[PDB]
RNA sequence: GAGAACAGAAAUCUCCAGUAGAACAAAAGGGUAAAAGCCCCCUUGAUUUUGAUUUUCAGUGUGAAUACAAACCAUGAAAGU
RNA sequence: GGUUGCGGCCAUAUCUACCAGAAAGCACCGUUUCCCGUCCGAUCAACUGUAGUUAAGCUGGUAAGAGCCUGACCGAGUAGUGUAGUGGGUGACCAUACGCGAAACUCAGGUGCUGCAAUCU
């Protein structure tokens, strides 16, 4: 029935981690290891704590929305969610962050010459007769077409390709390895 | 080789049992589950030979708990004496949960901003198969018609096309009013009265036909509609005497002088030379 | 998407730091307040301490001796209504309820398939929350099951569009004024044909009526008007199975015609000219009312609910004798029908000059208030069950609500992108309900005056849209061949 | 009154590595003697001497279960003569056996066709696999209620009224 | 195939991190109090935690090469040792690592009036809910072992952080004192671990708004002593402890619209 | 292991003994099982819209790359993935 | 106390040769027209509680079985190993005082605990 609790030393709050942090005191002969009735100490100290706690979330400033069924997002019409403040506790992070800052012999020479990163379109292109598009690389790209070309007018010519395909291939390959160890 | 019953490792309790599907049991356990702290509810159901079961969970540490729970057989008290089930008995059950749970939390007849907050539940068909047309979905339509509000589709009701995209409500009409039981009846009815002996044999011996029996569920569905209580069996000849005669029935262990005499005779008659 | 501006470093700061921890801790003042009622009642100057609003209704509840809870209104400053002397001798006013609460309409059902046409029209049943019937742009019209949202007795008989629908007050006659230019008659229990078609009329049939339960001499059966496009409206027996007259006023098209409560008639037109029939004179007119610039549309009274559930309550206690349905109409008709103490109903025009009109029929012909603002053709109109208020929906995508007794003008219902088409009050005067020429269906809480909850669904826009009886569920329909049944 | 011979299964296979013609034969003597449809079955790799590769379609098979297995099977042990071993049963209760010329029961010559013939297996039982078939609460079968050799073989000696052969 | 590098995405150093791994790993003594201990806490780390089966011969404070193999060959940052001694009774060695490196270790020593979860009323809960922390007494500023073990156990229990929280998942609360008060030089108190669930019951003092509390005990009920601790070094402190980097006159109000002051 | 006509030492079949000794875009810490293994059905992916990193001569409202998020798109009855 | 549904702890819960189980619960069990899937209604689908029996399946017990589990000065306050003195041997590697801190062997003992709901002579 009572609702109010005071402190004469007024605790510290976190209140995105739902905790407080109290200055007060204890007693050491409210709860000493040989006393039967301890635990009521411990319960008439918490609940007030847990007092001020529920005390300040619902003081807080909350969130109310408009939805309906099927809420792929979020809450709906009828939930609603406090916003908490954010969290002040300094707590360590467990793996350091992730910074994969080189250059590797592309980049270095796209700026000491203008080149300027392209713009990323599209995967396909146009075939001239026939009028498909077929894609240069992702499905049935064209360069794998000297590949079911029947003749090549002038060792079997197509074989050389490929051959100088996977020569370059390679040779991308490894100076992704040589990039990675520099 | 002991080795053999020794290295290996072996599943969980419920798991050597053919009860429980944890890897479904972790989906379901882990809602979201990074956006909010909502608790999850449960809709487990369950059937059986002579027996649907349905139930409202929701877990804990400790392990569940039951919040309500419907099982086949109070329709008798409402007016549903047979064929307990059927779709209509899966209906009828799952209508029945779903007016007893909105009846006992009291819809109508720390939340304390707002506010209705329609009641969620998500649908735990255990073991059971997914096929179109099926009884445990039954369930699932007459719990959501009932009143609770549970996500699903509408794939998977008796009449749905795989052709195109439409469910044709006529198939689900006579589903629900034994259309298919009657049309069944009919066809049966119509040729051979041997079968139809053996079957329908409580039919028999109330007299039944095929409207009448849609009458009987018509006037069902507002019977479950009307007093959803869930009173208890009068529990007579109780616990106490329950055990007694159990005991008397239940084997028993034995004791260290008897275990000690069974050696003794043995290696006394059967060891020293016959 | 377009987001929300995220806060600032100091906007965060404001956030970290304690907030008001209110506690209404102590707290005594000698406060003075002074009581009334808001037609004519103040019924008185004292010092208490503290105390709750709950404790206001009780309070007062036991100072008249009642055993009804109110609402309590102060300082009528955008009349705000210690939680009343935190915003800044007290004026409260205290306000009846007649309780009773529903759920809001939130989720959703499946759509429902059937007739493959453009939905039209679409009527729940006054006597049972779970009976609804609809009629479609096909030549049929459909009832449906709305317990386990299955159609039932698919009824057929019209050769045209299936227009207008309408409902019996009694629960008894299901009346479809098709476009081919009669009507029929429907049971809504088997799906017969009732004899045949009330013909009589010359061009498509518009709109249907009935007298009111407390206008039928008790053990007689109701009677029926319906208007078409001919500019006359007839008279029909239920019985009698032909026209009894026809009242002749109206030169253009008579768009919406309703049968009043102390025994008249209204008639709005495409005359620019609302007029008033007396029918004890065999159907003769009294009053004709030329104020609208171009011609008018959808005429709407104050206690149509009273008139249209027809003596079945907020629970369906079904009737057992015609005189007690006659005494149930008579209570449900005087709640609402001497407000102030004194027989009053009211009438209210809309029409395309963008404005709408207030009319006292018993009065005068003069208008009370003419109620001006919206930027498109007004296209419908409601008041509130309780006559307390009135809203109309326009067709510029907004809503505006205004006090149903002097005209007044309150706020501006906003959210909608195309047209509005037809709006529909709660059954306790909670919550309004609109469709519109958008996809959605939104609901609007009348008391702050915002938007609780939009939903969407369709596939095209709507067209019809009602609520229910009891306040349980919400229909709809439109383009999109689907019916689909809206409840919490 | 429960521990009872009821016949299962009976599967009629025919094993000819070809991805020819002679396999159609065979599913269409399948097709015209049992009537369903015949399922197929191929090759795990190679040996170079049975004349297959990997997925091969080497065999073709029947499996028919009730009255009309239980006619097929009187059927084809009618053919030979009711003369079966003591050996052709599985240590768990089955038999088998094969016979060629497939007008020995039901066909004619037809030379639209050649001749073959269904190598046999009758699976036997008692009732009561529910428990090693079913999807929940799928367990083991009992020692006690587990079918042996040589009660079905009195069973077998049964009526159809077999020869000893050697035993 | 690509649900091998699924894997190593999960486990790249992420901008804020995901939830906390903990790990149980047994030791070379061990009982069934101890054991059942280690399992009461485990109770509150589903379903996001790991724990080994068979036994293991670790010593911490000793040798270091196979607790760091075990944290990074589970990906966890939490470990949870539970061993027992004649020397030292149920020592419960607690672990914070960082980037495959001992953070810090922490001695333990659970009292012999210890309680499961079947000790008192069990009271229902639900699986995977966001805690409440209560932390008491003055020493939680200052003393630097006491500013360990309560950032230890923030970082053990909280699970994630979000910034919309309802209102229905607030069931319980975790309960956190020292043993009486006492001054330095003199030897440290214990410090106790209290996990309730707190209800709610109207006011009619307060109005609708602020309901008043009661706690009431599921299990368990621990006090624990502190014993051998460790202290990470200072580099590798700053650069665990860092911020992730994701102006004048400029400022955002409603609708955007960046504006400025010219003064 | 028992058997099953052609058919042998491996051709194809039916039933138990099965802790992973058969497989993995893994090599260690273990194994997920009614799987992360086999087969089957539905299906795009270089989507578009703004704060952090850097570079443009319309300094050129990001024009574009890239990091991060958010609306979506696929599938599932569903929780979800 | 028996039995069923949702589970936690995941062998003191498992494998093996037998014995037994009143009622209730549940399995076995017949069917193929409706929805549903195959070569085949054995598996899934649907129907009834209709013709039957405990052989099943399930449950308890019986075994010094395999396996497993607990406590203990059971090894062992030690094997080993971190600190202080000229303790020493030229040394392989180890004496003297505080610490840290083991294991196989052996002894006693044991072969499910239960949460939430329904139900039974």
Not at chain 3, 190 to 206: F, V
Request: proline share 5%; with cysteine.
């Amino acid at each position: 029935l009572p609702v109010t609790v005071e402190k004469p030393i007024p605790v510290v709050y976190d209140l995105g981690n739902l905790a407080a942090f109290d200055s007060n005191v204890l007693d050491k002969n409210d709860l000493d290891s040989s006393n039967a009735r301890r635990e009521e100490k411990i319960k008439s100290l918490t609940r007030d704590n847990v007092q001020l706690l529920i005390n300040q979330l619902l003081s807080l400033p909350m969130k109310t929305t408009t939805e309906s069924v099927g809420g792929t997002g979020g809450q709906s019409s009828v939930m609603t969610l406090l916003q908490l403040p954010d969290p002040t506790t300094d707590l360590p992070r467990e793996k350091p962050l992730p910074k994969a800052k080189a250059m590797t012999k592309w980049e270095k020479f796209a700026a000491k010459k203008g080149i300027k990163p392209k713009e990323r379109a599209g995967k396909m292109i146009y075939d001239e007769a026939s009028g498909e598009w077929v894609p240069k690389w992702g499905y049935k790209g064209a360069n794998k077409k000297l590949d079911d070309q029947w003749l090549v007018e002038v060792i079997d010519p197509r074989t050389l390709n490929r051959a100088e395909r996977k020569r370059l291939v390679k040779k991308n390959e490894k100076q992704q390895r040589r990039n990675m160890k520099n | 080789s002991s080795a053999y019953s020794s290295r290996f490792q072996t599943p969980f309790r419920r798991r050597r049992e053919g009860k429980t599907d944890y890897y479904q049991r972790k989906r379901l356990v882990t809602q979201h589950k990074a956006k909010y702290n909502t608790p999850k509810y449960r809709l487990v159901v369950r059937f059986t030979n002579k027996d649907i079961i349905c139930q409202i969970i929701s877990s804990t540490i400790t392990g569940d708990v039951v919040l309500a729970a419907a099982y086949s057989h109070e329709l008798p008290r409402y007016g549903i004496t047979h064929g307990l089930t059927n779709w209509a008995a899966a209906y009828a059950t799952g209508l029945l949960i779903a007016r007893r749970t909105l009846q006992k939390l009291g819809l109508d007849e720390e939340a304390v901003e707002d506010g209705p907050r329609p009641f969620k539940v998500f649908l735990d068909i255990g073991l059971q198969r997914t096929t179109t047309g099926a009884r445990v979905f039954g369930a699932l339509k007459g719990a959501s018609d009932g009143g609770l509000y549970v996500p699903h589709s509408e794939n998977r009701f008796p009449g749905w096309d795989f052709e195109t995209e439409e469910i044709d409500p006529e198939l689900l009409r006579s589903y629900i009013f034994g259309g298919h039981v009657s049309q069944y009846m009919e066809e049966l009815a119509d040729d051979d009265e041997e079968r139809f002996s053996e079957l329908f044999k409580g039919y028999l011996a109330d007299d039944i036909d095929a409207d009448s029996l849609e009458d009987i569920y018509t006037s069902a569905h507002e019977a479950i509609r009307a007093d959803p209580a869930f009173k208890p069996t009068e529990k007579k000849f109780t616990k106490e005497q329950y055990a007694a005669e159990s005991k008397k029935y239940r084997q028993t262990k034995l004791s260290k002088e008897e275990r000690a005499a069974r050696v003794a005779a043995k290696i006394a008659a059967l060891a020293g030379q016959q | 998407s377009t987001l929300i501006p995220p806060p600032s470093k100091k906007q965060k700061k404001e956030a970290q730091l304690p907030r008001e921890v209110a506690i209404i801790p102590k707290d005594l003042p000698n406060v003075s307040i002074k009581f009334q009622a808001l037609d004519t009642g103040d019924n008185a100057l004292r010092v208490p301490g503290a105390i709750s609003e709950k404790q206001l209704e009780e309070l007062l509840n036991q100072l008249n001796g009642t055993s009804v809870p109110y609402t309590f209104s102060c300082t009528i400053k955008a009349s705000d209504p210690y939680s009343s002397l935190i915003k800044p001798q007290i004026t409260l006013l205290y306000t009846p309820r007649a309780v009773f609460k529903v759920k809001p309409v939130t989720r959703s059902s499946s759509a429902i398939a059937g007739h493959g046409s453009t939905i039209l029209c679409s009527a729940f049943a006054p006597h049972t929350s779970s009976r609804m019937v609809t009629g479609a742009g096909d030549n049929t019209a459909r009832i449906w099951d709305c317990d386990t949202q299955t159609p039932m007795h698919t009824l057929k008989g019209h050769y045209n569009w299936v227009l207008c629908v309408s409902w019996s007050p009694d629960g008894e006659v299901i009346a479809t004024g098709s476009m081919d230019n009669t009507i029929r008659l429907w049971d809504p229990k088997s799906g017969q044909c009732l004899g045949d078609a009330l013909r009589g009329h010359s061009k498509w049939i518009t709109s249907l009526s009935w007298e009111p339960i407390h206008l039928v001499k008790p053990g007689s059966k109701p009677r029926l008007a319906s208007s078409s496009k001919d500019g006359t409206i007839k008279i029909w027996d239920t019985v009698s199975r032909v026209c009894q007259y026809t009242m002749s006023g109206h030169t253009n098209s008579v768009s919406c015609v309703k049968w009043g409560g102390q025994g008249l008639l209204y008639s709005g037109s495409h005359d620019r000219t609302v007029r008033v029939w007396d029918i004890n004179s065999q159907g003769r007119c009294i009053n004709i009312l030329k104020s609208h610039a171009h011609w008018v549309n959808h005429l709407s009274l104050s206690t149509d609910y009273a008139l249209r559930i027809g003596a079945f309550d907020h629970t369906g206690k079904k009737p057992s004798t015609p005189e007690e349905a006659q005494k149930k109409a008579l209570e449900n008709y005087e709640k609402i029908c001497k407000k102030n103490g004194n027989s009053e109903e009211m009438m209210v025009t809309a029409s395309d000059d963008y404005t709408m009109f207030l009319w006292n029929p018993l009065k005068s012909t003069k208008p009370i208030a003419r109620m001006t603002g919206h930027q498109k053709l007004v296209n419908h109109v409601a008041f509130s069950p309780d006559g307390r208020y009135i809203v109309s929906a326009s067709f510029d995508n907004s809503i505006k609500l205004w006090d149903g007794r002097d005209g007044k003008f309150i706020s501006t219902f906003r959210g909608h992108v195309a047209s509005v088409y037809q709006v529909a009050w709660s059954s306790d005067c909670r919550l309004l309900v609109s469709c519109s020429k958008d996809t959605t269906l939104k609901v609007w809480d009348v008391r702050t005056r915002k938007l609780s909850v939009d939903l969407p669904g369709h596939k095209d826009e709507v067209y019809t849209v009602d609520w229910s009886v009891d306040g349980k569920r919400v229909c709809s329909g439109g383009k999109d061949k689907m019916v689909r049944l809206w409840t919490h | 009154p429960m521990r009872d011979l009821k016949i299962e299964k009976l599967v009629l296979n025919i094993s000819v590595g070809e991805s020819g013609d002679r396999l159609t034969r065979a599913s269409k003597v399948l097709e015209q003697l049992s009537g369903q449809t015949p399922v197929q079955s191929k090759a795990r790799y190679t040996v170079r001497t049975f004349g297959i590769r990997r997925n091969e379609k080497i065999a073709v098979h029947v499996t028919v279960r009730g009255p009309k297995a239980e006619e097929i099977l009187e059927r084809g042990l009618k053919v030979k003569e009711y003369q079966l071993r003591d050996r052709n049963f599985s240590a768990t209760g089955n038999f088998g056996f094969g016979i060629d010329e497939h007008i020995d029961l039901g066909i004619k010559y037809d030379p639209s066709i050649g001749i073959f013939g269904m190598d046999f297996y009758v699976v036997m039982n008692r009732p009561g696999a529910r428990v090693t078939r079913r999807k929940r609460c799928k367990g083991t079968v009992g020692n006690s209620h587990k079918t042996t050799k040589e009660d079905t073989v009195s069973w077998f000696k049964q009526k159809y009224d077999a020869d000893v052969l050697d035993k | 195939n690509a649900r091998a590098k699924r894997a190593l995405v999960k486990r790249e150093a992420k901008l804020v991190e995901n939830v906390k791994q903990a790990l149980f790993i047994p030791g070379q003594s061990c009982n069934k109090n101890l054991h059942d201990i280690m399992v009461d806490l485990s109770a509150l780390k589903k379903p996001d935690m790991k724990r080994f089966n068979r036994k293991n011969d670790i010593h911490p404070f000793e040798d270091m090469s196979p607790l760091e193999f075990f944290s990074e060959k589970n990906d966890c940052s939490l470990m949870v040792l539970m061993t027992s001694s004649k020397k030292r009774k149920n020592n419960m060695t607690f672990i914070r690592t960082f980037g495959y490196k001992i953070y810090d270790m922490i001695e333990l020593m659970v009292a012999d009036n210890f309680k499961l979860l079947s000790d008192f009323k069990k009271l229902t809960f639900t699986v995977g809910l966001k805690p409440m922390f209560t932390f008491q007494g003055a020493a939680f500023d200052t003393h630097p072992v006491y500013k360990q073990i309560k950032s230890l156990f923030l970082d053990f229990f909280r699970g994630e952080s979000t910034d919309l929280q309802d209102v229905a998942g607030l069931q319980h609360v975790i309960s956190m004192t020292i043993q009486g008060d006492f001054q330095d030089g003199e030897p440290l108190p214990n410090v106790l671990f209290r996990v309730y669930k707190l209800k709610s019951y109207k006011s009619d003092q307060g109005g609708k708004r602020l309901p008043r509390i009661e706690l009431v005990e599921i299990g368990p009920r621990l006090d624990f002593k502190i014993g051998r601790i460790h202290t990470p070094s200072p580099d590798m402190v700053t650069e665990a402890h860092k911020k992730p980097k994701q102006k004048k006159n400029v400022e955002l109000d409603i609708m955007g619209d960046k504006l400025g002051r010219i003064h």
